Design a protein around this ligand. Structure first.
Ligand SMILES: *CC[C@H]1/C(=C/c2[nH]c(/C=C3N=C(/C=C4\NC(=O)C(CC)=C4C)C(C)=C\3CCC(=O)O)c(CCC(=O)O)c2C)NC(=O)[C@@H]1C
Ligand SMILES: *[C@@H](C)[C@H]1/C(=C/C2=NC(=C\c3[nH]c(C[C@H]4NC(=O)C(C=C)=C4C)c(C)c3CCC(=O)O)/C(CCC(=O)O)=C2C)NC(=O)[C@@H]1C
Ligand SMILES: *[C@H](C)[C@H]1/C(=C/C2=NC(=C\c3[nH]c(C[C@H]4NC(=O)C(C=C)=C4C)c(C)c3CCC(=O)O)/C(CCC(=O)O)=C2C)NC(=O)[C@@H]1C
Ligand SMILES: *[C@H](C)[C@H]1/C(=C/C2=NC(=C\c3[nH]c(C[C@H]4NC(=O)C(C=C)=C4C)c(C)c3CCC(=O)O)/C(CCC(=O)O)=C2C)NC(=O)[C@@H]1C
Ligand SMILES: *[C@H](C)[C@H]1/C(=C/C2=NC(=C\c3[nH]c(C[C@H]4NC(=O)C(C=C)=C4C)c(C)c3CCC(=O)O)/C(CCC(=O)O)=C2C)NC(=O)[C@@H]1C
Ligand SMILES: *[C@H](C)[C@H]1/C(=C/C2=NC(=C\c3[nH]c(C[C@H]4NC(=O)C(C=C)=C4C)c(C)c3CCC(=O)O)/C(CCC(=O)O)=C2C)NC(=O)[C@@H]1C
Ligand SMILES: *[C@H](C)[C@H]1/C(=C/C2=NC(=C\c3[nH]c(C[C@H]4NC(=O)C(C=C)=C4C)c(C)c3CCC(=O)O)/C(CCC(=O)O)=C2C)NC(=O)[C@@H]1C
Ligand SMILES: *[C@H](C)[C@H]1/C(=C/c2[nH]c(/C=C3N=C(/C=C4\NC(=O)C(CC)=C4C)C(C)=C\3CCC(=O)O)c(CCC(=O)O)c2C)NC(=O)[C@@H]1C
Ligand SMILES: *[C@H](C)[C@H]1/C(=C/c2[nH]c(/C=C3N=C(/C=C4\NC(=O)C(CC)=C4C)C(C)=C\3CCC(=O)O)c(CCC(=O)O)c2C)NC(=O)[C@@H]1C
Ligand SMILES: *[C@H](C)[C@H]1/C(=C/c2[nH]c(/C=C3N=C(/C=C4\NC(=O)C(CC)=C4C)C(C)=C\3CCC(=O)O)c(CCC(=O)O)c2C)NC(=O)[C@@H]1C
Ligand SMILES: *[C@H](C)[C@H]1/C(=C/c2[nH]c(/C=C3N=C(/C=C4\NC(=O)C(CC)=C4C)C(C)=C\3CCC(=O)O)c(CCC(=O)O)c2C)NC(=O)[C@@H]1C
Ligand SMILES: C=CC1=C(C)[C@@H](Cc2[nH]c(/C=C3N=C(/C=C4\NC(=O)[C@H](C)[C@H]4CC)C(C)=C\3CCC(=O)O)c(CCC(=O)O)c2C)NC1=O
Lengths: 96, 172, 177, 231, 162, 172, 172, 172, 172
């Protein structure tokens, strides 16, 4: 049944699966929720963070999405990116 | 390692941003919980040998094969190393509770533990039952009101029990 | 060796400077409060023998395992040496209070005392407690607040002379620690 | 006279400089007798050396060497002789040397005495014949007298896992006690009192791991414990 | 990270111990200081572009050769002035990160480690950045324990360049 | 190493005593001096590169035989070690300021430093001159009331100056 | 490691044969161009800091996202590690130019470097661009006659350009 | 390592049993022929140098491609390493003869040895020929009747032959 | 270390001599007392904890200043070092009983033990009466016939009491 008491955190329920199912005012991991976005310093097309800036590897390590026991841990084997491009001539020639 | 205030700094630097007033105001909501977070790790540290041995006693009453001759906790050395494992996991969940997030637990304790137990022949699904029995011994202790002023610390109880859940799905 | 006036000169001879007027204001108040310093040494020397027989008796009543067979105040030869090990501390402090500088107990008393004491097996934590009691008796005679003996001075304030002599006793404890 | 055979190096973190002035929380706590420690602080050097050579699970009372400890407290042996004396100790030969072959014992003692991983597989092959022809006492002396030991740790520092975390990251390389346990997949089988090699998660009819939903009244329990004074 | 929280965990974990009151008091001293240390970060962020374009102009006043001399290392072009005000904002942003964390964590990882090797290679003189930090140290306008917190991280940056 | 609170505890255990109320009330006076003590240590650690560099530059001005060809400070490697040795001593004096006693200055800095300098040929009297020039450079900074509440802290600057004299007579 | 002469002996020992007359005369050809090979490595190591700091400056102007926030050469330490690895690659290339073969460059510079860069998230195709920028900054300087007697050493320059190409293709 | 006596104990401890009376009686039969077991390792040890050097000499007469150029036993270091591999294996067979079981032979000599020879490029089938040449050389010595009372050792000699045979199939 | 056998051998190599027949006889006499010697060492070993812990309890009862606060065995660090020292003397005496001459006791236990206790502050005359109590507790415990065939065993307990007397004089 539902989670009702403080005693249920140690006996019956484990952890919310999404941010909508989380405790009011906190994340799905139990921490306080921060507004996720700050003030961009140094607006500039060539310098400064932009749409073509690369993704720091320490953003997935900070939120813990690099451990296989994490909710947001991505497995890259069964995705559409792992599929062979059928518009390549060496793929349609080998498969034909 | 990261604490909960250094996680938001690392998310903001990987984008070259300042911190807005909405983000600062959410970090001073984390400071105001500061004395209730310190009471929770004090109740876990002060009762730390009754968390471990009451929940190991419970583990062999309902799985008595682990201490029968031929089991994994059968000898005095493998019994002592079994209680060492539970004090180790309880140590790092206690570290992740003052830090505010589980990164010191993730790479110093849980990183490579599931693969360690497979090379030893230790039942990793029974280590998860050991962590789950320390989970509610520690939660029933943190809901206990003795020695504390009056007020609300129920979002912190739900947070402490989530580090015990992360430690228990990482070992099965 | 170096009193309050010799301390000024050796720091001006480091710079080869003349001792002018801005550095003589610490020495014009050394002389202006000169009768209070002589009234402060006189309150220590006049009851120094009582100050020692109370300090090492007060050390023994707190640590009664010093006079047990195997303790360091066991025999009569060992207790007689302790009764002057702490009478020579009070002597070199009253030289330092008289001269207004610590360069006589740090050059004739405190140098190499910690090596001497652990060669003999003297417990230093009890040697500091004997010195610590004498520091409490010393400030209770500079200021006229001793319980069993009041002395006859003029009226005024000596809280700078009371804290100077309490800083001379603290470097004795900092030397054998 | 049979020199050691040549192996190739590999790229590792410790072969290359970190720029790292003012280190942080992942700096790994030099334990040295060059800082003149007292009796309470030489206990911490001894526990750190037990943790490094043995596991944390082999710091039992029956494992501790009380006479090797008292020769360190009197300045008779150095920390390089304490570390050598723990490897040639009777608990280390019984719990670690007897349940490994010569190739996995080299990589335990490289990881724990030199503080770094092996370069390649041929480095295990190169050192495992120092054990078989001269013994453990000859192998640990030619390993502590390399320039890799005398430059990093000297003769008065406890070893540590050199350069485990890159300075920007929060997740670093695996610790050497979790990476290499006491015995491995060989000697596991039935040679170390084992059975069945795996286990499904424990089933139960009271589920114990239910996920709270979006309307559950335990997600609002704050303020349920306590309200304002009344004004 | 040189937070007071992660220094306490690392102190307990060096000897394989639970967190006693030795380490909970280090965490408690962070929370008592975090009030003044977070109003300083809010006021430095709000005056960011005022302090950045002011401190850039103070370097061009004291070092006017940096706007005249030709070469890639100087602010004598439109790109060299964009990269110069980029670097003032880098030093300002790391100060505010240290104020919301407590302790000189972000400045050591992101700014100080490797800075001496960079300033030698690209011929960037560290006396320019000292002058830029001395401007912010005098013009942030804060007072009390809020300026006492802020200046402790401006001064920590000057000691690394000096 | 010891602080001032454990110095009075190591002396009470050696006689098997509880601390008396006078020793407790003398320790609680040291606690309320605590904010003024952290101001002095903050004032030194934030000017640390200018304490070292100015008092070095003032030392080779009045003693030009140190940096003349053949001098002890003449080459880049020997000039770098003279600046390291000035920074080490100022570091361990500021360590003994927050502690309250000089047990950390004695063992891990000053024990064996006259013996080390005599082995190398360093003029130990010139080192005592450089230590007394960092003393009055930082006694003058702790007497500066910029950004502090104006109260009285003359008893801790007389304490900080004593740790500089302790290090200066220990190398000659 | 092997040089060029010891590489020839290693072929001849494995067949158990003495060296032939043509293998001797091919070795005396490498002796004849020894002063032109020593003159190249002198030209490269004398400008070694300028090869690195100018090939980096051209890389961050061509790929500007490497110094933007989030880029892989963004912080003081990540910027100083890029200049470190370019200096390491250029150092072992200079070693392989006096030896005559790439045995030292393969063994103790390139072994495992591709897998190191994948684990860090470092773009290996961008490291190859910076090595090719160091290639033609060194080849253009090795072809400069200011200080050398006039002559043709273009076979040696086509050998130096192959060590740079070897390190460029074994890093992505 | 285990001997024949502790092999029975370690198997009995995994069942939680005392030893049965037919297990003690099978152990006391080992003690009855203990003098004849010691005479076997007395003959093998005393001629151990001649077992290695005579069977190695016969290995290269019949496999002359091992010591031709390119062969695995062609150099001074590769040939002396072939001699010490035979002396290592002959040493660990005699450790398995006084113990009674092949637990020191398997754990300390034969574990992971087939994969080591595959990494080195050593022909593993020829190492088995050298072990079999040492097998009959020491069986011929074990059946010598010089300096012994005449009796039947034929079950002990057939056990020594099984230790060399186990070493020869564990290496290819 | 030497036993009674290799002591006589080592005195003959210095002269370059064989052993005389009167020394083979005196070495064969102590073989015939072999079983009587092993019975003594087995008695002292089997009661090793009760020899020590009774002699220590009888030591602090008559010298109560060793454990009252400020004494040399007052703290559990120092008290466990005292009990450790008493069973180092007992352990090295029974090594000398097995060998036959005090060479292992004289070298690695007694040489420098007087200088060690002098340099620490430990009363050496109190370690003598701690050794004398273990002599009378273990020559009375090697003089009872429970378990041993009654012959005569008095020439060897005069030797065992001679090793305790050697240890008690070399601590002062
Ligand atoms: C009741 C517990 C279960 C159990 C445990 C058990 N574990 C071991 C052995 C190891 N445990 C670890 C784990 C860690 N090491 C670390 O450093 C850290 C983080 C700080 C962790 C979590 C390791 C590395 C080992 C093996 C190394 C060693 O023991 O030296 C053992 C003993 C194995 C042995 O036989 O030697 C036991 C018995 N076993 C159970 O049955 C319980 C379910
Ligand atoms: C002397 C202090 C004792 C005592 C000693 C005697 N023992 C005699 C014979 C004996 N002792 C042993 C045990 C010994 N041998 C071992 O192999 C081991 C350990 C594995 C031990 C402890 C054995 C086996 C024997 C029998 C051999 C023999 O008969 O000599 C003995 C001889 C009898 C006699 O002549 O009196 C003596 C004296 N006996 C004592 O009464 C005191 C207390
Ligand atoms: C929550 C699960 C508990 C509970 C917690 C509360 N604690 C409150 C105040 C408080 N707690 C401490 C101790 C803590 N601070 C430290 O510095 C250290 C280490 C030395 C520890 C253990 C102190 C000192 C204080 C006083 C702070 C104050 O006076 O405000 C508290 C007060 C309410 C609030 O702060 O808003 C609560 C609710 N109380 C409970 O009922 C549950 C069981
Ligand atoms: C009593 C307060 C102490 C204690 C005192 C003992 N001191 C002993 C010997 C001793 N003390 C000194 C230092 C003394 N001589 C000086 O010149 C100066 C300063 C100018 C001082 C403080 C020395 C040099 C000696 C050596 C022996 C001698 O010459 O007399 C001592 C030893 C007596 C003995 O061993 O027979 C004692 C007992 N010891 C204590 O336990 C309390 C705490
Ligand atoms: C002494 C030589 C100085 C000086 C010291 C004083 N500070 C006084 C109060 C005070 N100081 C601080 C800052 C300090 N506390 C911290 O926790 C930290 C670091 C995080 C620092 C730097 C605070 C917060 C306070 C207020 C609390 C209190 O009142 O104790 C103070 C009292 C005023 C007076 O009575 O004069 C003094 C004397 N002030 C000086 O004038 C000299 C230069
Ligand atoms: C080809 C890429 C160059 C070039 C090379 C030539 N160098 C010639 C002679 C030469 N080079 C050096 C420099 C070098 N040799 C050393 O021994 C040392 C250091 C000790 C260095 C740096 C020397 C000393 C000599 C003198 C020998 C001689 O005169 O031959 C040279 C002459 C002919 C030849 O050696 O085959 C050539 C062609 N010259 C060029 O035009 C391009 C730029
Ligand atoms: C078996 C391959 C031999 C053989 C062996 C027999 N030896 C017998 C007794 C015996 N064996 C040894 C050698 C060994 N025992 C030791 O204690 C030591 C050194 C510590 C060694 C090297 C000795 C000394 C003895 C004498 C003891 C005794 O006489 O029992 C033996 C039993 C004797 C018998 O049957 O009469 C056998 C069968 N005999 C053979 O024919 C093959 C060649
Ligand atoms: C402005 C005050 C002065 C100035 C600036 C200037 N800087 C550069 C180049 C660089 N500056 C940095 C500094 C940092 N990078 C970081 O990631 C951080 C921490 C977050 C710092 C402090 C670096 C790495 C470079 C080189 C790469 C880049 O372009 O950013 C230049 C260009 C020099 C060149 O050779 O390209 C200039 C002009 N110079 C002045 O004259 C002003 C006085
Ligand atoms: C500078 C004002 C004066 C001066 C200094 C000088 N010192 C050295 C050399 C050493 N100093 C030390 C001291 C320490 N090392 C430590 O690790 C610690 C902390 C415990 C201390 C206190 C040591 C060990 C050396 C020798 C090692 C080294 O060379 O670095 C030198 C160099 C002497 C030389 O010939 O190498 C110098 C120049 N000398 C002066 O003239 C100034 C008065
Ligand atoms: C610079 C042009 C490019 C770049 C470089 C970059 N590399 C690293 C990190 C490492 N590089 C090494 C390299 C070596 N180790 C060796 O032992 C040898 C010789 C055998 C080499 C060449 C190693 C081990 C590391 C990791 C450890 C460390 O960083 O010290 C970084 C590190 C920062 C990061 O988080 O990646 C950087 C920036 N990156 C680029 O973007 C350029 C294309
Ligand atoms: C000789 C009969 C055959 C032969 C031998 C040969 N062996 C090697 C090299 C090694 N052999 C070992 C063997 C062991 N290591 C162990 O730890 C144990 C017990 C578990 C054994 C039995 C090892 C470690 C090596 C490598 C050591 C080294 O490289 O020096 C070689 C290699 C010589 C070389 O330089 O590569 C050779 C030739 N090979 C033959 O041809 C004979 C059939
Ligand atoms: C076990 C036995 C025992 C004692 C003997 C006393 C010893 C004693 N007296 C004083 C403390 C003092 N002792 C004196 C000494 C004297 N006052 C005079 O009038 C005389 C001239 C002289 C004694 C002959 C003075 C002046 C003080 C301080 C003021 C006072 O307490 O009277 C202190 C200080 C407390 C401390 O800081 O440690 C102690 C331990 N207490 C004991 O427990």
């Amino acid at each position: 049944d539902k989670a009702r008491s403080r005693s249920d955190w140690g006996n019956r329920n484990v952890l919310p699966a999404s941010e909508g199912d989380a405790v009011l005012g906190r994340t799905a991991k139990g921490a306080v929720a921060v507004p996720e976005f700050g003030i961009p310093q140094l607006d500039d097309p060539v310098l400064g963070f932009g749409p073509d800036s690369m993704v720091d590897p320490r953003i997935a390590e900070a939120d813990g999405a690099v451990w296989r026991w994490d909710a947001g841990f991505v497995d890259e084997s069964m995705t559409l990116a792992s599929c062979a491009d059928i518009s390549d001539e060496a793929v349609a020639d080998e498969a034909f | 390692m990261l604490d909960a205030f250094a996680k938001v700094v690392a998310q903001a630097d990987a984008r070259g941003e300042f911190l807005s007033n909405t983000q600062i105001d959410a970090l001073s909501k984390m400071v105001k919980e500061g004395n209730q977070r310190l009471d929770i790790v004090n109740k876990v540290t002060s009762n730390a040998s009754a968390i471990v041995t009451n929940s190991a006693r419970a583990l062999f009453a309902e799985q008595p094969q682990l201490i029968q001759p031929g089991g994994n906790a059968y000898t005095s050395r493998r019994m002592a190393a079994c209680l060492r494992d539970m004090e180790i996991v309880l140590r790092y969940v206690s570290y992740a509770m003052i830090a505010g997030d589980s990164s010191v637990l993730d790479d110093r304790c849980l990183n490579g533990l599931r693969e360690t137990y497979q090379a030893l022949g230790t039942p990793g699904s029974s280590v998860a039952v050991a962590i789950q029995k320390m989970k509610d011994a520690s939660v029933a202790l943190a809901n206990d009101t003795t020695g504390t002023p009056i007020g609300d610390c129920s979002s912190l109880v739900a947070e402490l029990a989530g580090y015990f859940d992360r430690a228990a799905v990482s070992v099965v | 060796m170096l009193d309050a006036f010799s301390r000024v000169v050796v720091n001006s001879d480091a710079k080869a400077a003349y001792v002018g007027g801005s550095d003589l204001q610490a020495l014009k108040s050394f002389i202006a409060d000169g009768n209070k310093r002589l009234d402060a040494v006189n309150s220590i020397v006049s009851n120094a023998s009582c100050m020692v027989s109370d300090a090492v008796s007060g050390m023994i009543c707190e640590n009664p395992g010093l006079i047990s067979p195997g303790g360091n105040c066991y025999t009569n030869r060992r207790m007689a040496a302790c009764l002057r090990d702490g009478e020579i501390i009070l002597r070199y402090v009253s030289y330092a209070l008289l001269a207004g500088d610590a360069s006589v107990l740090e050059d004739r008393c405190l140098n190499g005392l910690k090596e001497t004491y652990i060669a003999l097996g003297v417990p230093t934590n009890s040697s500091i407690r004997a010195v610590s009691i004498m520091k409490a008796q010393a400030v209770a005679f500079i200021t006229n607040t001793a319980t069993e003996r009041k002395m006859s001075f003029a009226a005024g304030d000596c809280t700078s002379l009371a804290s100077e002599v309490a800083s001379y006793f603290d470097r004795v404890g900092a030397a054998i620690s | 006279s049979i020199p050691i055979l040549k192996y190739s190096l590999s790229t590792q973190n410790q072969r290359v400089e970190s720029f790292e002035v003012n280190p942080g929380d992942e700096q790994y706590r030099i334990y040295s007798t060059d800082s003149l420690p007292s009796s309470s602080e030489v206990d911490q050097i001894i526990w750190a050396a037990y943790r490094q050579i043995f596991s944390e699970h082999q710091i039992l009372k029956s494992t501790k060497q009380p006479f090797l400890e008292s020769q360190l407290r009197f300045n008779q042996i150095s920390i390089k002789d304490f570390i050598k004396g723990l490897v040639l100790s009777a608990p280390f030969r019984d719990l670690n040397y007897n349940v490994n072959n010569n190739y996995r014992f080299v990589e335990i003692c490289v990881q724990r005495v030199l503080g770094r991983d092996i370069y390649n597989e041929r480095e295990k092959i190169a050192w495992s014949i120092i054990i078989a022809t001269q013994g453990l006492e000859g192998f640990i002396d030619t390993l502590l007298n390399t320039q890799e030991y005398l430059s990093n740790f000297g003769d008065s520092i406890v070893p540590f896992q050199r350069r485990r975390i890159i300075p920007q990251r929060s997740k670093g390389e695996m610790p050497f006690n979790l990476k290499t346990p006491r015995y491995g997949i060989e000697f596991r089988s039935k040679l170390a009192a084992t059975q069945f090699s795996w286990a499904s998660p424990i089933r139960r009819f009271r589920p114990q791991e239910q996920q709270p939903k979006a309307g559950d009244p335990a997600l609002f329990l704050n303020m349920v414990q306590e309200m304002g004074p009344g004004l | 990270m040189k937070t007071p929280i992660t220094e306490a965990i690392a102190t307990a974990d060096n000897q394989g111990r639970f967190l006693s009151n030795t380490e909970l008091q280090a965490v408690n001293g962070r929370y008592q200081r975090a009030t003044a240390s977070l109003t300083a970060a809010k006021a430095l962020t709000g005056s960011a572009q005022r302090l950045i374009t002011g401190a850039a102009q103070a370097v061009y006043n004291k070092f006017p050769y940096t706007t005249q001399m030709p070469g890639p290392a100087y602010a004598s072009s439109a790109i060299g002035k964009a990269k110069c005000a980029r670097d003032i904002g880098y030093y300002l942003r790391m100060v505010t990160y240290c104020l919301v964390v407590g302790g000189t964590g972000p400045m050591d990882e992101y700014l100080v480690a490797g800075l001496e090797e960079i300033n030698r290679s690209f011929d960037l003189s560290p006396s320019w950045y000292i002058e830029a930090l001395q401007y912010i140290k005098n013009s942030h306008g804060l007072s009390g324990q809020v300026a006492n917190e802020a200046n402790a991280y401006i001064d920590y940056a000057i000691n690394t360049l000096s």
